[PDB]
């Protein structure tokens, strides 16, 4: 069939990309702080 879009769930892709980027940043910063604080 056609007309398969009743509503929008655009947040899923945006949430995935943002969580990937921010988790990478947070884990890198945590590694840096742990190295700083031994």
């Amino acid at each position: 069939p056609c007309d398969s879009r009743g509503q929008r769930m655009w947040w899923a892709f945006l949430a995935s990309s943002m969580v990937t980027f921010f988790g990478g940043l947070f884990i890198i910063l945590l590694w840096r702080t742990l190295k700083y604080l031994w």
Binding site: S16, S17, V19, T20, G23, G24
Partner: protein, 33 residues
């Protein structure tokens, strides 16, 4: 997202380590030959 990125990173690291190990023993164990 993060799981696939970690899987790709682990695969790349494993491939690099394996290739380096293979080349290392190919080169040293046959230095005289």
């Amino acid at each position: 997202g993060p799981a696939s990125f970690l899987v790709s990173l682990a695969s790349c690291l494993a491939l690099g380590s394996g290739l380096t190990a293979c080349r290392a023993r190919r080169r040293r164990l046959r230095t005289a030959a």
